[PDB]
Each structure stands twice: as C-alpha cells, then as structure tokens.
Design a binder for this molecule. Sequence first.
Ligand SMILES: O[C@@H]1[C@@H](O)[C@@H](O)OC[C@@H]1O
Ligand SMILES: O[C@@H]1[C@@H](O)[C@@H](O)OC[C@@H]1O
Ligand code: NA
Lengths: 339, 346
Amino acid sequence: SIKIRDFGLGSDLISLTNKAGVTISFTNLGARIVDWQKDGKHLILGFDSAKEYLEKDAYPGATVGPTAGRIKDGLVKISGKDYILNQNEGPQTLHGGEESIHTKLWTYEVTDLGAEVQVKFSLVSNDGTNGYPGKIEMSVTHSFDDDNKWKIHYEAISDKDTVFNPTGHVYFNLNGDASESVENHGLRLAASRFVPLKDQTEIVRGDIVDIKNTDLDFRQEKQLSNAFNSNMEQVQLVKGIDHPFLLDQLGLDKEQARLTLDDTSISVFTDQPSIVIFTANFGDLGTLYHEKKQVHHGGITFECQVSPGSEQIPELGDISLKAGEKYQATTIYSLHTKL
Amino acid sequence: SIKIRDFGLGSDLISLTNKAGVTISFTNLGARIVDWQKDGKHLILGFDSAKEYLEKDAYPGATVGPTAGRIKDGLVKISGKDYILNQNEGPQTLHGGEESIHTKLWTYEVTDLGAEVQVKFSLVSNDGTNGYPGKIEMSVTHSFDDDNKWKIHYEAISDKDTVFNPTGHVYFNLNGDASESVENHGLRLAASRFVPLKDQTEIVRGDIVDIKNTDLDFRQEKQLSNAFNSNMEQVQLVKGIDHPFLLDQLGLDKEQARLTLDDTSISVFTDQPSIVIFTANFGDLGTLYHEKKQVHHGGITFECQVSPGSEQIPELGDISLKAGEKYQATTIYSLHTKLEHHHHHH
Ligand SMILES: O[C@@H]1[C@@H](O)[C@@H](O)OC[C@@H]1O
Ligand SMILES: O[C@@H]1[C@@H](O)[C@@H](O)OC[C@@H]1O
Ligand code: NA
C-alpha cells in the first residue's frame, strides 16, 4: 500500500508497505528516507517531522550533493580552471555547501508497479549554485519492493562541465533505538584499503593504506566494538570510524557490505567504488531521536560514492561530469531476516 | 476556514475562505496565487494542477525574481563590480533567469489570525544561483482578510551585496473566462509617464515619455479597448501593453490602479514606484485555462516593482541590496463591489 501525508513545512511523507508488511517512508524534503521498520522496530534513524530535520540535523537519510564529502579549501579544477565552491566547514566545502540539496523540497512522482513502487524526486540545481557550474537537472529514484530491497537510482545531466558525486546519508541502527550503540552490530566489508584522514579537519591525508589484518579489516565479519576499541591512530583521531573504504571488486552484483544484528541483516550493493563509513561519533551531543537521546556510536552510515579526496589523490577517481553526459548511479540496501 | 490538499508533483494547494464567502487559493510552487473567486466566478487566471503550470506557463500568479523583468545582456553592476546573470531570453536575463524561483517548491507555514490568515512561503537563493551573489533568504507572505484584501509582503536578507526586485505575476480577467478579452474592462491608473521599449527584444529604449492625453493615459477611467485599438508605435510594437508605468504619487495609502467590470472592482495599492502592465498579447497561442482557449488580450497583470531598465535609466531607481540590509515590499489587491457605475457594451 501507499500512503501520503503532510510531513510539515509543506513537505510530504510518502510511506510504502510491501507484501511482507515492511514499511519504508520518504520525504521530498531532501529526497530522503525517514523510516524503515519491521515488526514495529525502526532499522534506521529518523525524525518525526520536517522541522526536526531542519532544527536538529539535516543530514540523516538525505540525498547529499552535488558532491558528497569534504573538498579541501572548497577547490575543484574544471577543464583546467579553478573553481571555488561554497565553504561551510571552515575552508572546506562539505556535502555541497550550505543550504544544499538536502534542505530543498524536491518535486516527485509516485509509480506503482505492484511488486515494486517507485518515488521519483527531481530538482534543478541552477548554474552557479554554491559555485557549481550547471544547470544540473537531477533525479533520485527511491524504490521498494516485495523482496525487501530498497534501491536508490541517481541520474543527472548538466548544461556545462561540472562535478557530480552525490550519496545517500541514511544511518542504520538495528537496535531500533538511538540511545544504544551499534558496537554490538557485526560488520562485513569487501575492502582491503582505506583513505586516512590528515587530521581533525578530516581532509584526506594524501595516501591510500592497506588495512588487511588491522582493526579495520572487516573482510571477515566482525563486531564493531573491535574497531571501536582499537588504538590505531586513525580510530583514535575521530573516535570511531569516519573514512572512505575502497571496495576490492566493483559491480552491482556483489554484496559489498553487510550489517548484522541477531536475526536481522542489511546487505549493501552499489556500482560505486567506495563506501564512506561514519559511526555517529557525536560524543555527548545527545541529539533526540523519537524522544531518545543519541549516544556516541548510536548510528552508522554506508555512503556509497567515489571516495572524497580525489582532488589530492587522483587514483581515487574522477568526479567530473561533462556537458551533456548522463550521470547514473545505483545503490541498494537489501533487508533479510533469519529463520 | 483553511483547507489544504496535494496540488500535484508534491506541491500543495492552500485554500482560504473569509467571513464574506470569498475564496482565494495559493500553491507553494512558486509562492503563487492559484485562484480567487467571488460567487463562483474566477477573478484571475490559473490552472487546475501544478503540472499545468509547469507544462503550459509557469509565470501566472507567481512570485518572480530575484529581479523582475528584463536586464539588458544580463549585466548588473554590484558595488563597482560587473556581474553577468543567467541569460534566458536571448542575451537577456528575464525574470531572474531560467528555472528561477517561480519554479521551486517553497516551504511554508500558515498563521491564523482570525480576521486575517497569513501564508508565509520561504526559500533560500544560494550564493551564485543564476549568477546572483547571496545567499539570499527570502520570504513572501500572502494574506487574505475579512475585508477582501489580498496582501503580498516580501522580505529578504543577503549575505552579500546583490540586486533584489521581485514581483507578483497574477493576471486578472474579470470576465472569469480566458477566452474573453479584457478590452471591456475599465482601467484607472495614477501614472503620467511610461517607459518605452527599444524594440521587439523589449529592453528599455532609454527615455521616459509623458503619456498625458494619449491612448495610454488612464488617469481618468477608460475602457481598455482604447489602448488595444491604438496605433501608437509602442502599442503596435508589442500588440497591446507590456510596459512600466511610473506612478505619479508614491505611498501605500494611495489607490494607484483600479480595474472594473460591471459591479466588480479590483484596487491596487503598493509601496513600489512603478507598475508593469502586460496584457497577455499572446496572439493565437491559445493556452487552455480551464478548458477555455485564451484569447489575445485575455488577461492583464499589475506587476508592482521598481521599473525594469534602471541599469540604463538610473532615474528609475536602484535595486541594489546591501549585505545585511532587510528588503521589504508590500503590494495589495483589494476587491470591491459596486464601487462605481460601470455599464458598458462591447
Ligand atoms: O564527518 C562525517 C562525514 O564524513 C559524513 O559521514 O557525514 C557526517 C559527518 O560530517
Ligand atoms: O513580456 C512580459 C513581461 O514584460 C512580463 O510582464 O511578464 C510576461 C512577459 O514576459
Ligand atoms: Na504536501
């Protein structure tokens, strides 16, 4: 079934329930996922109204872009030219700059295919917006099916050469409660390398590091507490994880990661080369989710995209988008329950 | 009463009814007026869904900006600096550029004050959007009261020195039918001068001309047909009216314009210096409004703003907005019945 309701400030909440009784819900405010629940338990973090996102934290569940992550000094080179983007975290451009696409109301259309239902959000980023050349016509399609698969499909076309590398910022918490650390979750991740951070500013350090046989090697399922209790300077630097992991094998058919808690597991698939993992290292911040005070490590992301820092480490890839080329990206979060 | 429902594409329709029974409705798509009815008759032009605006004509009833009108070659000078804005009409920047504010979903909140209901729409124009320095935090409040006054109040604050001069693009048609020309309406307008356009590109000619005693003189009420039938160069150039009229006396207290048909009148008040009047000179385009094919001259706007062309004619005003400085503008459209005797035939 599909249900639409006012979510506040003019935004809508679109809720989809599949044959299995699973419920996923989205909002046009930032083309974002608000909730995902089974047998009355939330699997992800989210608020109860649009206002909360705007007042508390606008990132959770959102489509962030045009470029996800931190860009050093807000500087990108486009066709040999330097461009300075909006700086909203010191001199860095973080998540597209201030008042970015995650804070705008996107238009949308719902398509019911029976076994699958799609919600297509659209937004136009005007040329020059936050320093980005455009116009960029963007669309993010969130779909949910009877097999419990939640798919995100991105598309974009720009009038001018520009940069483009968005991501979905959902935070998972299989505890179904923010006051509970995800340290008890087990994680498996098909990556043998990562990108270390320079320092507290979180810009990249400059190198690519082999993680095999370290507290961060999750090639084999392991409990998060491990990483969390690690003494690796990188863990100690951010007080958890807040890094880009490089996938060993690319392609949508490969399960790239898996988050497990008891009977319940989330599998991640993507056509992207990297997954940025952030473990809600907010300390005592205590953001309120459903009346529950969030704890340090009370969430974890799987931001699939081209690794941040390609400006300094070209091996990471290239986020350029040439005029007229069609950008496409796909990320899938599949839900399973052991019998 | 206040009612709300989805209007299409994720936009909403907000419908108000005052104690007199008059109904007016707005959409967050472009902080825009959708309809205004008296006794079941439309007083303005509008569509029945969001998609129509997007597919037919996205300007009607909309909030347009950040700068309303045409800017020659998209060139503005901001604090000694030259800036080129998005050019969407040939080399011209028309109504803020392509995919401007009238095309966005604004957030909003409704305030019920009893005799008055306010709908405040908000949007942020990011720094650099369409070439405009910012960021600009904007807000448009549309309100309707028991006295049948529909008021528009604009507010804005920029992080950087920029330009700002928005307007409301409603189209009136007291016939309540797009297929009926407004040549039968009576118009009274407190303006002695106008701004001629250079040519078909519609940029300003460069001079200000006195229109007293010509077919464009509406100081004393006259039928619109007088203008439409005129062979004055300016009328012929645009095939009707599409010009800024400079108000003779400024201030929100004064009735600047009055449009009448039979027993119905719409009065215009504003704190702005000019009113740009466009009479839907679309020829045979025939855009469908409620299944009625619109006729040439099937509508008239009263876009109150600082006149377009100030870039070339400094005398017109200055639309610059300094960083941190609060912009405010107020325009009011009031509805009246039997304000005067208007009994004509066409
Ligand atoms: O530092 C993290 C960033 O890496 C990402 O995960 O989004 C949230 C935080 O700002
Ligand atoms: O030419 C007119 C313009 O002057 C304004 O009134 O909006 C509609 C058309 O673009
Ligand atoms: Na809505």
